Design an enzyme around this catalytic site. Structure first.
Site, short mmCIF file in Angstrom:
data_model
loop_
_atom_site.label_atom_id
_atom_site.label_comp_id
_atom_site.label_asym_id
_atom_site.label_seq_id
_atom_site.Cartn_x
_atom_site.Cartn_y
_atom_site.Cartn_z
N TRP A 177 45.17 -60.41 -22.88
CA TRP A 177 44.05 -60.41 -23.87
C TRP A 177 44.49 -60.95 -25.24
N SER A 209 28.54 -60.46 -33.39
CA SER A 209 27.78 -59.22 -33.20
C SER A 209 28.34 -58.13 -34.09
N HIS A 262 45.89 -55.34 -35.12
CA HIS A 262 46.19 -53.96 -35.50
C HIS A 262 45.01 -53.27 -36.17
N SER A 298 35.89 -34.77 -35.18
CA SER A 298 35.64 -33.83 -36.30
C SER A 298 34.33 -33.06 -36.09
N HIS A 341 54.58 -55.48 -36.27
CA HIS A 341 55.25 -54.69 -35.24
C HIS A 341 54.83 -55.07 -33.83
N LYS A 346 45.01 -35.31 -40.31
CA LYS A 346 43.79 -35.10 -39.52
C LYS A 346 44.03 -34.17 -38.34
N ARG A 359 55.79 -55.12 -18.49
CA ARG A 359 54.35 -55.16 -18.24
C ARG A 359 53.93 -56.58 -17.82
C1 HEA Z 1 43.48 -46.20 -30.36
C2 HEA Z 1 44.29 -47.35 -30.45
C3 HEA Z 1 45.63 -47.19 -31.05
C4 HEA Z 1 46.11 -46.42 -32.07
C5 HEA Z 1 45.31 -45.42 -32.94
C6 HEA Z 1 47.44 -46.68 -32.25
C7 HEA Z 1 48.33 -46.02 -33.15
C8 HEA Z 1 49.73 -46.35 -33.38
N1 HEA Z 1 50.45 -47.33 -32.71
FE1 HEA Z 1 49.81 -48.46 -31.14
N2 HEA Z 1 48.99 -49.81 -29.92
C9 HEA Z 1 47.77 -49.91 -29.34
C10 HEA Z 1 46.68 -48.99 -29.65
C11 HEA Z 1 46.78 -47.98 -30.68
N3 HEA Z 1 47.91 -47.67 -31.37
C12 HEA Z 1 47.54 -50.99 -28.52
C13 HEA Z 1 46.32 -51.41 -27.74
C14 HEA Z 1 48.78 -51.63 -28.46
C15 HEA Z 1 49.29 -52.88 -27.69
C16 HEA Z 1 48.38 -54.05 -27.47
C17 HEA Z 1 49.02 -55.06 -26.50
O1 HEA Z 1 50.21 -55.41 -26.74
O2 HEA Z 1 48.21 -55.35 -25.61
C18 HEA Z 1 49.68 -50.92 -29.36
C19 HEA Z 1 51.03 -51.31 -29.70
C20 HEA Z 1 51.85 -50.73 -30.67
C21 HEA Z 1 53.04 -51.29 -31.11
C22 HEA Z 1 53.73 -52.58 -30.61
C23 HEA Z 1 54.64 -52.18 -29.40
C24 HEA Z 1 55.06 -53.47 -28.68
O3 HEA Z 1 54.21 -54.24 -28.17
O4 HEA Z 1 56.32 -53.65 -28.53
C25 HEA Z 1 53.49 -50.41 -32.07
C26 HEA Z 1 54.74 -50.63 -32.82
O5 HEA Z 1 55.06 -50.05 -33.85
C27 HEA Z 1 52.50 -49.35 -32.17
C28 HEA Z 1 52.68 -48.24 -33.05
C29 HEA Z 1 51.64 -47.31 -33.37
C30 HEA Z 1 51.75 -46.29 -34.35
C31 HEA Z 1 52.95 -45.96 -35.19
C32 HEA Z 1 50.53 -45.70 -34.40
C33 HEA Z 1 50.14 -44.54 -35.35
O6 HEA Z 1 48.85 -44.91 -35.94
C34 HEA Z 1 50.11 -43.19 -34.57
C35 HEA Z 1 50.11 -42.02 -35.64
C36 HEA Z 1 49.83 -40.73 -34.88
C37 HEA Z 1 50.78 -39.78 -34.70
C38 HEA Z 1 52.19 -39.88 -35.16
C39 HEA Z 1 50.41 -38.51 -33.93
C40 HEA Z 1 49.70 -37.39 -34.78
C41 HEA Z 1 50.58 -36.98 -35.95
C42 HEA Z 1 51.13 -35.76 -36.19
C43 HEA Z 1 50.96 -34.59 -35.28
C44 HEA Z 1 51.95 -35.60 -37.46
C45 HEA Z 1 53.48 -35.42 -37.37
C46 HEA Z 1 54.16 -36.63 -36.71
C47 HEA Z 1 55.28 -37.14 -37.18
C48 HEA Z 1 56.09 -36.64 -38.35
C49 HEA Z 1 55.79 -38.33 -36.40
N4 HEA Z 1 51.48 -49.59 -31.37
C1 HEA Z 2 39.85 -49.02 -24.25
C2 HEA Z 2 40.86 -49.67 -23.60
C3 HEA Z 2 41.31 -49.42 -22.21
C4 HEA Z 2 40.99 -48.52 -21.26
C5 HEA Z 2 39.87 -47.45 -21.37
C6 HEA Z 2 41.74 -48.71 -20.14
C7 HEA Z 2 41.64 -48.00 -18.93
C8 HEA Z 2 42.57 -48.17 -17.84
N1 HEA Z 2 43.61 -49.04 -17.81
FE1 HEA Z 2 44.08 -50.42 -19.15
N2 HEA Z 2 44.52 -51.88 -20.47
C9 HEA Z 2 43.98 -52.08 -21.71
C10 HEA Z 2 42.96 -51.29 -22.33
C11 HEA Z 2 42.35 -50.17 -21.62
N3 HEA Z 2 42.66 -49.74 -20.36
C12 HEA Z 2 44.63 -53.17 -22.38
C13 HEA Z 2 44.35 -53.54 -23.83
C14 HEA Z 2 45.58 -53.67 -21.52
C15 HEA Z 2 46.58 -54.84 -21.78
C16 HEA Z 2 46.06 -56.14 -21.13
C17 HEA Z 2 47.10 -57.29 -21.33
O1 HEA Z 2 48.24 -56.99 -20.94
O2 HEA Z 2 46.71 -58.36 -21.80
C18 HEA Z 2 45.53 -52.83 -20.42
C19 HEA Z 2 46.48 -52.96 -19.37
C20 HEA Z 2 46.58 -52.02 -18.26
C21 HEA Z 2 47.58 -52.00 -17.32
C22 HEA Z 2 48.82 -52.93 -17.36
C23 HEA Z 2 48.58 -54.25 -16.56
C24 HEA Z 2 49.86 -55.02 -16.61
O3 HEA Z 2 50.69 -54.84 -17.52
O4 HEA Z 2 50.10 -55.85 -15.68
C25 HEA Z 2 47.27 -50.95 -16.46
C26 HEA Z 2 48.13 -50.61 -15.29
O5 HEA Z 2 48.06 -49.53 -14.69
C27 HEA Z 2 46.06 -50.39 -16.89
C28 HEA Z 2 45.37 -49.38 -16.16
C29 HEA Z 2 44.16 -48.74 -16.61
C30 HEA Z 2 43.49 -47.72 -15.93
C31 HEA Z 2 44.02 -47.28 -14.54
C32 HEA Z 2 42.47 -47.33 -16.69
C33 HEA Z 2 41.36 -46.34 -16.40
O6 HEA Z 2 40.93 -46.48 -14.98
C34 HEA Z 2 41.75 -44.91 -16.62
C35 HEA Z 2 40.45 -43.95 -16.55
C36 HEA Z 2 39.42 -44.39 -17.62
C37 HEA Z 2 38.14 -44.75 -17.30
C38 HEA Z 2 37.68 -44.76 -15.89
C39 HEA Z 2 37.13 -45.19 -18.36
C40 HEA Z 2 35.68 -45.05 -17.94
C41 HEA Z 2 34.70 -45.07 -19.10
C42 HEA Z 2 33.43 -45.34 -18.83
C43 HEA Z 2 32.99 -45.54 -17.38
C44 HEA Z 2 32.35 -45.36 -19.91
C45 HEA Z 2 31.29 -44.21 -19.67
C46 HEA Z 2 30.23 -44.51 -20.70
C47 HEA Z 2 29.44 -43.59 -21.34
C48 HEA Z 2 29.61 -42.10 -21.09
C49 HEA Z 2 28.40 -43.91 -22.36
N4 HEA Z 2 45.62 -51.04 -18.00
CU CU Z 3 49.58 -52.56 -34.22
#
Ligand code: HEA
Ligand code: HEA
Ligand code: CU
Ligand code: PEK
Ligand code: PGV
Ligand code: DMU
Ligand code: CUA
Ligand code: MG
Ligand code: NA
Ligand code: ZN
Lengths: 84, 259, 227, 46, 514, 105, 144, 98, 58, 43, 73, 79, 49
Positions: free
Chosen positions: E126, E156, E240, E255, E290, E319, E438
């Site tokens: 993606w 959109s 990000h 909340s 990152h 939070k 992956r």
């Molecule tokens: C809901 C979506 C979501 C959210 C909110 C976050 C939140 C965070 N993510 Fe994640 N992230 C993804 C979705 C998300 N990420 C996705 C989709 C990817 C990869 C996409 C791809 O490659 O396809 C990714 C990839 C990703 C990377 C790149 C990894 C890589 O590809 O090699 C990194 C690197 O720093 C990272 C870090 C973080 C951090 C630090 C947070 C922070 O915001 C988290 C902060 C929260 C906490 C720490 C927990 C609660 C805190 C406490 C209880 C307080 C006390 C804790 C401490 C003192 C530690 N994320």
């Molecule tokens: C929101 C983001 C999202 C969600 C929900 C999910 C859901 C799931 N994903 Fe994910 N996944 C991604 C975002 C997400 N994924 C992304 C960003 C990648 C990286 C792609 C890339 O590498 O380029 C990825 C890649 C990824 C991989 C790695 C593929 C690879 O590296 O080769 C895998 C493997 O197990 C996986 C598995 C699953 C499974 C088993 C579920 C689910 O089956 C788990 C159960 C959850 C559900 C079944 C959701 C159902 C919700 C609804 C039906 C809506 C209902 C609506 C109302 C009530 C209004 N996903």
């Molecule tokens: Cu990021």
């Protein structure tokens, strides 16, 4: 940071018309003269088939595929050089 | 009967026709790029224009003719226009980032220099400087138009707005000529890419802004604007200043610093 | 290589990977403690019929739960950054090796002295010799002198790839037009495996890396025999 | 004007629960089935 | 009348309903794609026998779940239903433009399906990085259809962000300041600012990809002086912020749910919650690289992005601990929505912590592009979004429909999903630490045990999704109509009844300034 | 914020207002049970006598139930409070929930 | 007694242990004998019978605290049904293994694994802790 | 220079925009653009809540700078009290328009 | 020319129940039908084009 | 929340029908595709 | 007929919270000592013991005699 | 002086991960030196350090393409 | 009056648990799934070269 002009006390249409005809349009007329004086075609440089220029990774979706959209035969060579 | 000041809009087909026009333009560009055909694209452009015309027509009907733009509604439309311009600033920021990335670190394929080997930039003191004077001047004349309208002066509003539009058209025609005369093209590596895509999207916005000013010109001819209520004019002026400022950043970055 | 049911990192082959292991142990202890504390407090909040539903003043307790996380983050970041800059420290290699990614195989160039280069493809599963590893063996391994600082230079001649060897803590993207540098030092002889780590199309799963670490004198004679 | 109240503020009918079951079956089932038939389609091309 | 109401809508509730229906259908597509991923991986060897198709399935899975399931449900669906009601407004600021934000999504989804049907699909990830996504390694229409799908989704959401920001700033009661608006309304405003600023940068980058593919530009092509890494910066400068866009409305719903089922009039620490979401939003723009720690980045840039990324844990922790403090002393109602919200707090916390692991670039060298990252974001994003969505859906379904769910069935559904997602994703941490990449269609044999378990887990969540559809059917089939809802004095969206009339707040609320 | 005795005294005064109305009785009790405490007998006594002035026997019984509920798992608190209230219960003819069978599920 | 949809904007009755005195009485309309009971309530409550006192309580309130706080057997249904559906999932997985998956690669045959295991020990895979560390190279067997 | 020809709002505003303008001239706020100022809110001096119907939702910000607003329907009849702070409100139905 | 806004205000405020996009008169309906026909017809054609492009050709 | 009793009660048998129909609607088409994968790949 | 003593009636929730947060802290400190002993220090000692008398040439000769190398027979 | 070349040493001009410009600069330096030594007489042997460094660092295909472009007259750097 | 859970909860819990354990054990052990556990303590190494 306000140029060397200086005429306020209640800004208005009369002042902005003054600026339009007294500063803005004269400046356009001066740059128009400057541009019309430096116009005229210049000698095009030797063609060299540099590989970072005249890029063709897919034919263009018009013409014969090999001409840019605003192709000017006088100054835009093709990958094989200037057109005759 | 409502007792708030906001506008409940009549059910409308233009969101759907605008969405379908977007499908037809994008599938149309795909057909043009890959299947040698302009048909879908032409339909999509046509339905897009029809949608824009009828949608903004209806907004004029709702406001000038029906009275729904209370101060609260107008304030919302001010925020909406400001936010739209902010999103357009960030769109251009992406192209400026591309330009600085490529020019601050020219790769070996370019000769390791900027401008690349084999590129002969336009002289920024010739037509690019003229274009700068033209858009700066149009920012002065649109300010004259705005103050004439606020002061209730129909004739001078129209004169100043016509001058602003004339300058927008002058810029467009100069830029078209420059595009034709330029010895480099969009296919001339990252120099041509950044030059034509960034100035080309800017030129599109000059055309959009000029059209918007022309709409305001004809609405003014038809007495739509009052001396205190004329948000379409304000929005077009804000958009025009945005187009002017984007040009100043292109002139300084691409034409001058990048030469 | 990984072994069946493995839970953590591969054993370290290089000093930098050993550092990463100890830093990971430190960070995981913190992760476990915070995740467990949150789970426990959830259960504590949910296990009494006693109530207090009037407004609660926040600013006192918000000092604790910003200052203590900030301190924890500092305790992670300090060793984290130490390892980062230790990684980057000047090493003075005695050999440079290039690798070029391709769809779908790696080529290697050892051109400090002679013009040595070759391609390295996955062994198909149907051609594995008995006891060889499915999807990991190559026909031509990257033979390297053990106990020596090696400069690897990584690039690609087509799409992005990424050259990785987990047990040495290495992953460097392979980008056309770019020559990325990383350093490699194995404390031990042996065979060390990795896999392409930037999606590069249909056979991304099937272009692995095999380093073969031996004494210098064997490396020298191998190099000469590969010309 | 428009119908208001439970069962009336939706673009699908809930007047008959079995017709609804069919409609919901078709709706969610078509979305779930689509990727399987896209895969089949791509496999059958080559 | 049907066409006027449902294709020509200018009503925030009906448009919200359209988004919820669209997002639920997209969720089915995205789930089916995920089961195909896990079926390919559930035993060693090849299932599809065509890894280009595998790569297309992975790519489409992510785009469907992000752009057609989570954002339409959270922002289009809960945002349009709830935001005007929670501020006593009579609709959105731009009620007709709102309808175009909805109707751009079916065409956007059509373009994405088209990309997968023509040629060999877009098997890019993606991220759509060139040169894999360029016109030599992905010749033909698929990647261009994907780009255009993203353009329409981006328009959109940009127009929707303009709408939400305008509505929330301009259409509150005159006495209500921004610090008297509910947290979910804050969470939508902040998500909208993030969308407004980030999506135009993605649009610039994918447009440059489109012109490198079709107009012979070379933004990303070294032969012309371009650089593949520039695309990665523009993508992740959006990407990000996007991951915080995906969770912020979820934080807002959590909340409200935690407050409601704790029997509280208010969340603990309101202004800290506002501060925390604003801080997360701001820091979310200065951490993107990152996603690029292995591209050949200088050490001091790695140190900066490590440090700035870690600081996000501070507002996020405020939070989490504030949600725990809202539970504290509550009269706890063990409703199904509460179970979703408590599952969210724990699973989000696990995921956020593995994000802090990844923030350390030295460890990220070994973990990048492995299943450790997949495990991280399926906890913090996939479970985070899905559990907040299910919590909000169970909680507000009686408001939207006028009918109640069967709470015993809804608790059964929660239990099954909780087992399923954890069986699916927890073992992927082991696969990543032990080096499984992956985006792979098959794996060295050592990785078999955890891949088998993970794929078995994926079928448990399938059972949960099928049951969810049945539970919705049973509610509409049985027609138990809502009577009394507790705590309406601090939950304004319920005070007009269930469902509220088509027009609400035709007479605005009265709020004094004292 | 103040001392325990000052808190208790404000609540006793609240319920002892002779012309306290039904709304104020309910506001008082529903506010009081938000606090982290079981109300002192002297507060409950004043609330029960307010029930009497308001001719509301049922709310007097409910108030006894909410004392038992606020004690949570501390099973010693409610019998202590009923013990302290017995002279008032006898004087006013208030039956406890237990005496009415209202502790049965 | 009967709560109607069109009553949604009026003060309503609730049984909540944190809101002990709700905004309305449970029963608003009174029969002749109930009216007489409310008059008797204005006299000494010592003169009310137990049944009269219960009746006054049930006019004001719907459920007592003990009733509204009662525990239930619902958890058995929830956990049991969840385990049924998780069990049903294993039927799907059985179906998939039988009808969808073909044979796995030959590298999982016993003899292959035994040879591959020996070669892993010969290359000292994970020799510090993970794998070869568990092999006793002196005794030629797995460490105890 | 100067000249006229531009209509004024007085001349040409219409519809709801014109209603709002004319009401503002008279100091009136039928379309609820301004926040009402509280009375002391006692039973003798309740806050007076205009309505075109016989019920209207009140939001009460009980104390300055509270973030929590307390919402309830106010019905025609005897003054009602905010359930949080007790301050009094009384509906004054009808008038405004025709 | 002349200020005819009052005439347009009367027209678009007439109590005839028409939505604003049709309230100008019969030409609004014509323009609407043209727009919607091109949109729906164009969309059907795009679906035909998808069907064609979904399969290999020579 | 409180609510009215069902206007159209869905008995246990009716729920078993709705559940079975719902599950088959997801499982049959996908099962058909996955059962026939060999047929597709050999084409 | 014995009267009941007055029990504590105020602050019961806060008192519960304080007691268990302290207990949580004590457990966390205990787990941290166990983890440093069972994981972190165990790993440090395992690598240090491995390398203390490690002979890389002897390891190579073993691998070479087992036939594992392309470059060494 | 100071020979026994093993590989290209650390060069403070190019201290970061991207070493493209190190390859490029040494390729340019070698060829500029070589051109200078060929015109005004002399021996290319004085250019040897640059030769060994660019041969160590530069991908074979880059050297090959740059050589082809110098022969074609399309090399874009200055020599 | 006893509700659904009073009447059937015991049977649902007992039957559901019994069914779930039986079918997962059958799936895990009787249909040829290769879990590929660790060789350690399990596999006798065999000459390969
Ligand atoms: C809901 C979506 C979501 C959210 C909110 C976050 C939140 C965070 N993510 Fe994640 N992230 C993804 C979705 C998300 N990420 C996705 C989709 C990817 C990869 C996409 C791809 O490659 O396809 C990714 C990839 C990703 C990377 C790149 C990894 C890589 O590809 O090699 C990194 C690197 O720093 C990272 C870090 C973080 C951090 C630090 C947070 C922070 O915001 C988290 C902060 C929260 C906490 C720490 C927990 C609660 C805190 C406490 C209880 C307080 C006390 C804790 C401490 C003192 C530690 N994320
Ligand atoms: C929101 C983001 C999202 C969600 C929900 C999910 C859901 C799931 N994903 Fe994910 N996944 C991604 C975002 C997400 N994924 C992304 C960003 C990648 C990286 C792609 C890339 O590498 O380029 C990825 C890649 C990824 C991989 C790695 C593929 C690879 O590296 O080769 C895998 C493997 O197990 C996986 C598995 C699953 C499974 C088993 C579920 C689910 O089956 C788990 C159960 C959850 C559900 C079944 C959701 C159902 C919700 C609804 C039906 C809506 C209902 C609506 C109302 C009530 C209004 N996903
Ligand atoms: Cu990021
Ligand atoms: C000068 C006035 C002309 C009339 C008015 C025209 C307005 C067009 C406006 C839209 C432009 C949008 C896309 C811009 C892409 C590049 C065009 C750049 C500007 C330009 O016009 O570039 C020129 C033509 O290039 C070219 O390919 C032209 C290529 C033609 C196809 C352009 C459109 C391609 C698809 C664009 C999709 C954009 C998606 C945007 C999504 C935004 C987020 C929703 C350069 O001519 P040249 O012959 O190379 O060099 C001059 C040599 N003498
Ligand atoms: C040559 C053909 C080019 C075709 C393609 C491009 C087309 C665009 C044409 C340019 C835009 C024309 C916009 C016309 C808007 C007219 C309606 C209008 O201006 O409506 C006004 C409200 O503003 C409003 O909605 C303001 C509403 C917002 C308008 C924003 C317009 C700019 C954005 C256009 C799209 C840019 C996309 C760029 C993508 C790269 C009406 O209110 P007032 O003016 O106060 O009047 C009321 C008084 O009379 C009462 O006394
Ligand atoms: C990842 C999502 C899906 C996961 C789980 C799917 C569970 C499968 C449910 C059953 O699917 C059916 O299975 C039948 C076999 O049991 C197939 O019949 C097939 O096999 C029968 C014989 O075995 C023949 O009678 C039929 O003609 C032939 O179509 C049939 O087509 C298919 O619909
Ligand atoms: Cu090469 Cu992935
Ligand atoms: Mg990568
Ligand atoms: Na596979
Ligand atoms: Zn109040």
């Amino acid at each position: 940071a306000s140029a060397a002009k200086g005429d306020h006390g209640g800004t208005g249409a009369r002042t902005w018309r003054f600026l339009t005809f007294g500063l803005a349009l004269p400046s356009v007329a001066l740059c128009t003269l400057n541009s019309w004086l430096h116009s005229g075609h210049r000698e095009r440089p030797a063609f060299i088939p540099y590989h970072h220029l005249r890029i063709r990774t897919k034919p263009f979706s018009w013409g014969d595929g090999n001409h840019t959209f605003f192709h000017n035969p006088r100054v835009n060579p093709l990958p094989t050089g200037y057109e005759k | 009967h409502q007792t708030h000041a906001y506008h409940m809009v009549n059910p409308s087909p233009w969101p759907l026709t605008g969405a379908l026009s977007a499908l037809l333009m994008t599938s149309g560009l795909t057909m043009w790029f890959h299947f040698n055909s302009m048909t879908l694209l032409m339909i999509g452009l046509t339905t897009n224009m029809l949608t824009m015309y009828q949608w903004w027509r209806d907004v004029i009907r709702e406001s000038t003719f029906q009275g729904h733009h209370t101060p609260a509604v107008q304030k919302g439309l001010r925020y909406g226009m400001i936010l739209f311009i902010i999103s357009e600033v960030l769109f251009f920021t992406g192209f400026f980032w591309a330009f600085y990335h490529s020019s601050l670190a020219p790769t070996p394929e370019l000769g390791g220099c900027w401008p690349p080997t084999g590129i002969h930039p336009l002289n920024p003191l010739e037509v690019p400087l003229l274009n700068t004077s033209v858009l700066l001047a149009s920012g002065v004349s649109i300010t004259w138009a705005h103050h004439s309208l606020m002061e209730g002066d129909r004739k001078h509003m129209l004169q100043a707005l016509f001058i602003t539009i004339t300058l927008g058209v002058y810029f467009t025609l100069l830029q078209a000529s420059e595009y034709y005369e330029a010895p480099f093209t969009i296919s001339d590596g990252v120099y041509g890419s950044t030059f034509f895509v960034a100035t080309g999207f800017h030129g599109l916005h000059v055309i959009i802004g000029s059209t918007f000013l022309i709409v305001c010109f004809f609405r003014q001819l038809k007495f739509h604007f009052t001396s205190n209520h004329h948000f379409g004019f304000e929005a077009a002026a804000w958009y025009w200043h945005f187009v002017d400022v984007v040009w100043l950043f292109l002139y300084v970055s691409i034409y001058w610093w990048g030469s | 290589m990984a072994y069946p049911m493995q839970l953590g990192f591969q054993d370290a082959t290089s000093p930098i990977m050993e550092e990463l292991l100890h830093f990971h142990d430190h960070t995981l202890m913190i992760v476990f403690l915070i995740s467990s504390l949150v789970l426990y407090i959830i259960s504590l909040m949910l296990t009494t019929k006693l109530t207090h539903t009037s407004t609660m003043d926040a600013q006192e307790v918000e000092t604790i739960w910003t200052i203590l996380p900030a301190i924890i983050l500092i305790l992670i970041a300090l060793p984290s950054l130490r390892i980062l800059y230790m990684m980057d420290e000047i090493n003075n290699p005695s050999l440079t090796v290039k690798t070029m990614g391709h769809q779908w195989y790696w080529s290697y160039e050892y051109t400090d002295y002679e013009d040595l280069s070759f391609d390295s493809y996955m062994i198909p599963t149907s051609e594995l010799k008995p006891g060889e590893l499915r999807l990991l063996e190559v026909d031509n391994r990257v033979v390297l002198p053990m106990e020596m600082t090696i400069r690897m230079l990584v690039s690609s001649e087509d799409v992005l790839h990424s050259w990785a060897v987990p047990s040495l803590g290495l992953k460097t993207d392979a980008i056309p037009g770019r020559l990325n540098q990383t350093t490699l030092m194995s404390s031990r002889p042996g065979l060390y495996y990795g896999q392409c780590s930037e999606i590069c199309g249909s056979n991304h799963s099937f272009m692995p890396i095999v380093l073969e670490l031996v004494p210098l004198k064997y490396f020298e004679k191998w190099s000469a025999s590969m010309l | 004007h428009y119908e208001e109240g439970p069962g009336k503020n939706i673009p699908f009918s809930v007047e008959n629960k079995w017709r609804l079951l069919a409609m919901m079956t078709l709706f969610f089932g078509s979305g779930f089935a689509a990727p399987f038939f896209i895969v089949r389609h791509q496999l059958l091309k080559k | 009348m049907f066409i006027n109401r449902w294709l020509f809508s200018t009503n925030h509730k009906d448009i919200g309903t359209l988004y919820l229906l669209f997002g639920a259908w997209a969720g089915m597509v995205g789930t089916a794609l995920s089961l195909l991923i896990r079926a390919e991986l559930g035993q060693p060897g090849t299932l599809l026998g065509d890894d280009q198709i595998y790569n297309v399935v992975v790519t489409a899975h992510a785009f469907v779940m992000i752009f057609f399931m989570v954002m339409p449900i959270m922002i289009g669906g809960f945002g349009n239903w709830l935001v005007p009601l929670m501020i006593g407004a009579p609709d959105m600021a731009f009620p007709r433009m709102n309808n175009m934000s909805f109707w751009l999504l079916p065409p956007s989804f059509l373009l994405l399906l088209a990309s997968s049907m023509v040629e060999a699909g877009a098997g890019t990830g993606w991220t759509v990085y060139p040169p894999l996504a360029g016109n030599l390694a992905h010749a033909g229409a698929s990647v261009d259809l994907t780009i255009f799908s993203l353009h329409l989704a981006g328009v959109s959401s940009i127009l929707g962000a303009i709408n939400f920001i305008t509505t929330i700033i301009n259409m509150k009661p005159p006495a209500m300041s921004q610090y008297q608006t509910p947290l979910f309304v804050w969470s939508v405003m902040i998500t909208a600012v993030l969308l407004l600023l980030s999506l135009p940068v993605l649009a610039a980058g994918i447009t440059m990809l489109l012109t490198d593919r079709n107009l012979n530009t070379t933004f990303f092509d070294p032969a012309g002086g371009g650089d593949p890494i520039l695309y990665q910066h523009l993508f992740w400068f959006f990407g990000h912020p996007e991951v915080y866009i995906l969770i912020l409305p979820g934080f807002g719903m959590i909340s409200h749910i935690v407050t409601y089922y704790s029997g509280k009039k208010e969340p603990f620490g309101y202004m800290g919650m506002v501060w925390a979401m604003m801080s997360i939003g701001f820091l979310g723009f200065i951490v993107w690289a990152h996603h690029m720690f292995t591209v050949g980045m200088d050490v001091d840039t790695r140190a900066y992005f490590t440090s700035a990324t870690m600081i996000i844990a501070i507002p996020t922790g405020v939070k989490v601990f504030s949600w725990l403090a809202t539970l504290h002393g509550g009269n706890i109602k063990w409703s199904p929505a509460m179970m979703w919200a408590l599952g969210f707090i724990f699973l989000f916390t696990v995921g956020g912590l593995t994000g802090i692991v990844l923030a350390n670039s030295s460890l990220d060298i070994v973990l990048h592009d492995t299943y450790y990252v997949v495990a991280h974001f399926h906890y913090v994003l996939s479970m985070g979004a899905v559990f907040a969505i299910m919590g909000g859906f169970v909680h507000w379904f009686p408001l939207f429909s006028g009918y109640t769910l069967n709470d015993t069935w809804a608790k059964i559904h929660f239990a099954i999903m909780f087992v399923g997602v954890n069986m699916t994703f927890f073992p992927q941490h082991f696969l990543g630490l032990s080096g499984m990449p992956r985006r792979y269609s098959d794996y060295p044999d050592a990785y078999t045990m955890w891949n088998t378990i993970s794929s078995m887990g994926s079928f448990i969540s399938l059972t949960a999704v099928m049951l969810m559809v049945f539970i919705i059917w049973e509610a509409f089939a049985s027609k138990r109509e809502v009577l009394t809802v507790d705590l309406t004095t601090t939950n304004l969206e319920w005070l007009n009844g269930c469902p509220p009339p088509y027009h609400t707040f035709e007479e605005p609320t009265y709020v004094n300034l004292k | 914020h103040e001392t325990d005795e000052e808190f208790d005294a404000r609540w006793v005064t609240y319920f002892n207002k002779p012309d306290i109305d039904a709304w104020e009785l309910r506001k008082g009790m529903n506010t009081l049970v938000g606090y982290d405490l079981v109300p002192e007998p002297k507060i409950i006594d004043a609330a029960l006598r307010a029930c009497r002035r308001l001719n509301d026997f049922a709310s007097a019984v409910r108030i006894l139930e909410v004392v038992k509920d606020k004690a949570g798992p501390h099973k010693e608190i409610y019998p202590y409070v009923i013990q302290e209230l017995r002279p008032t219960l006898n004087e006013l003819g208030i039956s406890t929930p237990e005496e009415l069978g209202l502790d049965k599920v | 007694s009967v709560v109607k949809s069109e009553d949604y904007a009026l003060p309503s009755y609730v049984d909540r242990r944190d809101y002990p005195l709700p905004d309305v009485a449970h029963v608003k309309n009174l029969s002749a004998s109930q009216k007489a009971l409310k008059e008797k309530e204005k006299a000494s409550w010592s003169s009310l019978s137990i049944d009269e006192k219960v009746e006054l309580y049930r006019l004001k309130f719907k459920e007592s605290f003990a009733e509204m706080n009662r525990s239930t057997n619902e958890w058995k249904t929830v956990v049991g049904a969840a385990m049924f559906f998780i069990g049903f999932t294993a039927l799907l997985l059985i179906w998939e293994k039988h009808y969808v998956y073909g044979p796995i690669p030959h590298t999982f045959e016993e003899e292959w694994v035994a040879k591959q295991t020996k070669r892993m020990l010969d290359m000292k895979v994970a020799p510090i802790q993970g794998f070869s560390a568990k092999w006793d190279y002196d005794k030629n067997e797995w460490k105890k | 220079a100067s000249g006229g020809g531009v209509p004024t709002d007085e001349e040409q505003a219409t519809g709801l925009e014109r209603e709002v303008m004319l009401a503002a001239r008279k100091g009136q706020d039928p379309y609820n653009i301004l926040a009402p100022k509280a009375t002391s809110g006692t039973k003798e001096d309740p806050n007076l809540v205009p309505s075109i119907t016989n019920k209207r939702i009140v939001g009460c910000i009980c104390e300055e700078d509270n973030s929590t607003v307390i919402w309830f329907w106010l019905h025609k009849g005897e003054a009602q009290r905010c359930p949080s702070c007790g301050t009094h409100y009384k509906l004054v139905p009808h008038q405004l328009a025709h | 020319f002349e200020n005819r806004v009052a005439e347009k205000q009367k027209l678009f405020q007439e109590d005839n129940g028409l939505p604003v996009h049709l309230k100008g008169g019969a030409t609004d309906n014509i323009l609407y039908r043209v727009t919607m026909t091109l949109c729906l017809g164009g969309t059907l054609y795009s679906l035909y084009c998808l069907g064609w492009a979904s399969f290999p050709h020579k | 929340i409180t609510a009215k009793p069902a206007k159209t009660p869905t008995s246990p048998k009716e729920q078993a029908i709705g559940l079975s129909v719902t599950f088959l609607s997801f499982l049959l088409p996908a099962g058909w595709v996955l059962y026939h994968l060999d047929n597709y790949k050999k084409s | 007929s014995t009267a009941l003593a007055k029990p504590q009636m105020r602050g019961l929730l806060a008192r519960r919270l304080r007691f268990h947060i302290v207990g949580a802290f004590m457990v966390s400190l205990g787990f941290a000592t166990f983890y440093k002993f069972a994981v972190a220090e165990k790993r440090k000692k395992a690598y240090a013991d491995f390398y203390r008398n490690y002979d890389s040439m002897k390891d190579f000769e073993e691998m070479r005699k087992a036939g594992i190398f392309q470059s060494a027979k | 002086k100071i020979k026994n070349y093993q590989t290209a040493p650390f060069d403070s001009r190019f201290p970061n991960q991207n070493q493209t410009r190190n390859c490029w600069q040494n390729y340019l330096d070698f060829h500029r030196c070589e051109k200078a030594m060929t015109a005004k007489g002399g021996d290319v042997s004085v250019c040897e350090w640059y030769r060994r460094v660019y041969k160590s660092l530069c991908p074979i295909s880059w050297v090959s393409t740059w050589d082809d472009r110098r022969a074609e007259g399309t090399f874009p750097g200055k020599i | 009056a006893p509700d659904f859970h009073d009447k059937y909860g015991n049977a649902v819990l007992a039957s559901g648990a019994t069914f779930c354990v039986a079918v997962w054990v059958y799936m895990a052990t009787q249909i040829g799934i290769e879990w590929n556990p660790s060789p350690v303590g399990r596999v006798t190494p065999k000459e390969w070269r």
